[model samples]
Target: AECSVDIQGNDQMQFNTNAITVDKSCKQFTVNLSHPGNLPKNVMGHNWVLSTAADMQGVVTDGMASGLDKDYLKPDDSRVIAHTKLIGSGEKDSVTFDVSKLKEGEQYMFFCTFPGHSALMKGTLTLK
Candidate 1:
């Protein structure tokens, strides 16, 4: 398997899937995100942010202060492994990062950092 995956987010504050696997053979991993709702970015926006599970809460907290112009993520924050730009309905974004950043035994999580969306829009990621 290649180090690539697709994830979908919708207006209902949900993700189409909850788990992702990355193939360690690849030097880089990619995540493609899609928004299939009719809401605008500011209303029901979605973006995919990756970090260690233990860092999820703090990341989301600081990201909120970063605001939408920063895509709801801290600018050049070392905690974030990779992230997609915020997207509105019928829009999509993708992010690619070095697979070496992930460790085999470590835990990682992916979530939407659009203000209040993280409460339900979150999932686990694993490297194999």
Candidate 2:
């Protein structure tokens, strides 16, 4: 299984893939997110956030009010497993987290916390 994944967000508010897998043998997993459009952060920003699928909506709701300085995420919120920086076109960010934190059978997801983007820029994350 792969220990890392590359993700993409474009002008249309979409991610390149709908699923990701983290190998059990990996000590850590990295998420690389890049924006391929010409929009600016304030208009069409993006960030990769990880958490249990059940926590996805809550995180999204809270982040929507947090604004861009906080990367559209609640500061120091434990529900967030991992996340990348808020970025715009021609920019990229990455986040690395310990693989041990992911439990088997747990429903996990990765999504963009960019305001209303979660509705389309979210995906499942699995531990293998």
Candidate 3:
């Protein structure tokens, strides 16, 4: 797609890919997440969260404390650039964000914020 990427999460707490590149020409970018496993939301939920690499730990920590009712995310967290809703098996979600929010050469990270999922579900996102 011109300005969108689709990613998958599974019951094993993993994302399908480890990196993503956003084309600079696009005005906005979209991330689509889907869960293909058979687990339920509470037991094996997943969502995509994007932030500066430096803010990843903080975001995940705060999000974990926020609880699954909030999609494991803090309310209106300024550090989060974009995110998809928490989902379970056969579920899907998407998030769109302005391309201008990213700075050239700055490191960005995307991961699942579902409790301990980020340990294996994290990846890098870069603007080209």
Candidate 4:
């Protein structure tokens, strides 16, 4: 069975889809983010990053130093469940993580780590 989804990011600084579900039966889940806009990565880049909802604040706060060159993420940060490379328009990236890492009844979130992107680019993820 398919265990992944394709998400598209436009120049509007938004993720077309906000929520996703990971099936309990799947060993892993994946997200493919594509940029269909014309802006350059520096001006308008997008990446798919996942973490527990509880980790959102700290992770995003710390990611600022990592900057755009590192996809706005620090190196080898364990708090990050998974992430894809930052990409610009006409580019794409994907990330997959073990389904077992998610806890039942717990909240998980996925979003872009870019400076102010999360303010509008984040949403809940659930295991079903």
Q: How many angstroms is residue 34 displaced in model 4 relative to the true structure, after the best TM-score fit?
A: 0.3
Clashes per prediction? 0, 0, 0, 0
lDDT of 2 at 39: 99
Task: State the C-alpha lDDT per candidate.
Answer: 0.92, 0.91, 0.94, 0.86
With candidate 4 superimposed using the best TM-score fit, by how many Å does residue 48's alpha carbon deviate from the native?
A: 0.6
Q: Please name the candidate that would achieve the greatest lDDT relative to the true structure.
A: 3
Q: Which stretches of candidate 4 lie above 4 Å from their native place?
A: none
TM-score head-to-head 1 vs 2, winner: 2
Task: Indicate the residue-level lDDT of 2 in model 3.
Answer: 73
lDDT of 2 by residue, 21-128 (tens): 888999999999999999999999998899999999999999989888888888888899988898999999999999999999998999989889999999999988
lDDT of 1 by residue, 31-122 (tens): 99999999999999999999999999989999999998888988888888889999999999999999999999999999999999999999
Q: What is the TM-score of each candidate against the true structure?
A: 0.95, 0.96, 0.96, 0.94
**Location of the lowest summed lDDT over 10 successive residues in candidate 3:** 1-10
TM-score of 4: 0.94
Candidate 2 backbone clash number: 0
Full ranking by lDDT:
3, 1, 2, 4
lDDT of 2: 0.91
Output the lDDT of residue 100, model 3.
Answer: 100
Candidate 2: residue 89 Cα off by (Å): 0.4
